[PDB]
Amino acid sequence: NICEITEVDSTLVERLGQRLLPWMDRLSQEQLNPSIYVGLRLSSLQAGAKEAHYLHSLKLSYQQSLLRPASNKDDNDSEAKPSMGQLALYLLALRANCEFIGGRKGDRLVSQLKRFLEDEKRAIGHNHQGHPRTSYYQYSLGILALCVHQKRVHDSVVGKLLYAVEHKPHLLQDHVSVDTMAMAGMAFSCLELSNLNPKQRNRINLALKRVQEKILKAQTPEGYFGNVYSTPLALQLLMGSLRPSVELGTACLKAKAALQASLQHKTFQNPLMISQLLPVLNQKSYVDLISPDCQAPRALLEPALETPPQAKVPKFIDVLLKVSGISPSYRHSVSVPAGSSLEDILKNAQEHGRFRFRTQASLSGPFLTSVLGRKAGEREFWQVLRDPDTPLQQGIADYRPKDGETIELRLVGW
Ligand code: B12
Ligand SMILES: [Cl-]
Ligand SMILES: [Cl-]
Ligand SMILES: [Cl-]
């Protein structure tokens, strides 16, 4: 297949896998990450039966958190659980261990997921005025997750994703675009291969060509689908073929070369991103979770065990932090070692100034949710940009600012 990464330097792959390896000892509820587990299982790499403990921890935690008693002893909250889209990735994790979800606990989880989709269906509405509470990405992920376990979703649920893909000057924001198409594509593709909604078979097939079209349309001069980070999910979808073309073949070749290029430059630092890339580098996608092969051997990753101690004096960078989209705006001047994350800088400004911010856990890491006491609301988010007006492609923990950058935290409405 032409959309498949066919040749990768195994030492690059191994370095990527070494980035996931420490996460395998991070078993706390907020660190546990079903995406990382999936990515490893579908990769050419193994992070030990560190993996087994990890799935077991996922099982215990997702079950204990999501199946809690009918009425909790005086709180309405205690120990905020995984989200439904995370439950969807947890379902992918089980398939990655060649398990189907089951038993009474598994029935309840599946219902929770179906309720989620039904609730999103309702939120989206009638004829689609109205938004998902979460996103179409999680919507698609949910359908895909149920599909790979051979669980059917209501035709009206699937309809909502199909129509969104099908209808008009495409709804989706640029940020979500390719990634959401890729994920929806993978939901549709699973539906097809599974024949789970035969009453919309043709519609699904046409949604697939659509999804393919929009992804190729989104190709950048650099070769990326959307951006470097959407490219792996794009390729995950695209390697699933069934519409082989000359445009598609050329697009994939460009996409692949751009991706391999970025691998030489330590582009992929984010554990979730790596978890999305490794499968692709092993010619696998989430859609392979339909029939996962748990017998295939993988190369054991061993701990890097070396963190190079320079005893040098590091370069410092001087960075300007600025907050906009709220009143008052705020600025902060910080000088920190080169290689400091945006997050380090935030924590520094908080420590040594009038700054404050809050993040919350996500599978991509710390997600900035509140700056200076202003918490992003319903369709708001704290956008992170490098001045002038360039949205970062990494979040706070991964973005490592350059000398002289102005980094903007902008409250925006999408
Ligand atoms: C939906 C989405 C959003 C939504 C999320 C809110 C919503 N309505 O649900 C919005 C528009 C707010 C958003 C924002 C951003 N996003 Co975003 N987002 C996505 C998308 C399409 C799906 C994520 C998802 O739902 N995952 C599934 C569920 C189960 O996972 P989850 O971990 O529980 O999801 C949470 C986080 O993803 C959080 N979130 C969203 N984006 C990001 C990015 C980072 C770095 C973090 C830590 C968290 C985070 O939102 C979800 C909670 O609803 C992904 C695509 C992808 N390839 O994963 C990109 C993606 C994760 N986002 C990305 C980026 C870069 C950003 C921003 C940094 C953009 C910016 N310059 O401001 C910001 C986050 C800044 C911040 N405040 O911390 C990149 C990250 C790449 C990388 N190297 O890590 C991705 C992969 C898109 C891309 N191809 O570039 N995003
Ligand atoms: Cl339940
Ligand atoms: Cl990254
Ligand atoms: Cl805050």
From Swiss-Prot:
This is Transcobalamin-2. Cob(II)alamin binds at residues 86, 134-138, 175-179, 227, 230, 276, 382-384. The keyword Ion transport applies. InterPro entries: Cbl-bd_prot, Cobalamin_Transport. The keyword Nucleus does not apply. Gene3D superfamilies: 1.50.10.20, 2.170.130.30. Disulfide bonds join 3-252, 98-294, 147-190. Expressed in mammary gland, kidney, lymphatic nodes and liver. One of its GO terms (molecular function) is metal ion binding. It is found in: Secreted. Interacts with CD320 (via LDL-receptor class A domains). Keywords: Cobalt, Cobalt transport, Disulfide bond, Glycoprotein, Ion transport, Metal-binding, Secreted, Signal, Transport. One of its GO terms (cellular component) is extracellular space. It comes from Bos taurus. Primary vitamin B12-binding and transport protein. Delivers cobalamin to cells. GO terms for biological process: cobalamin transport; cobalt ion transport. Glycans are attached at residue 76.
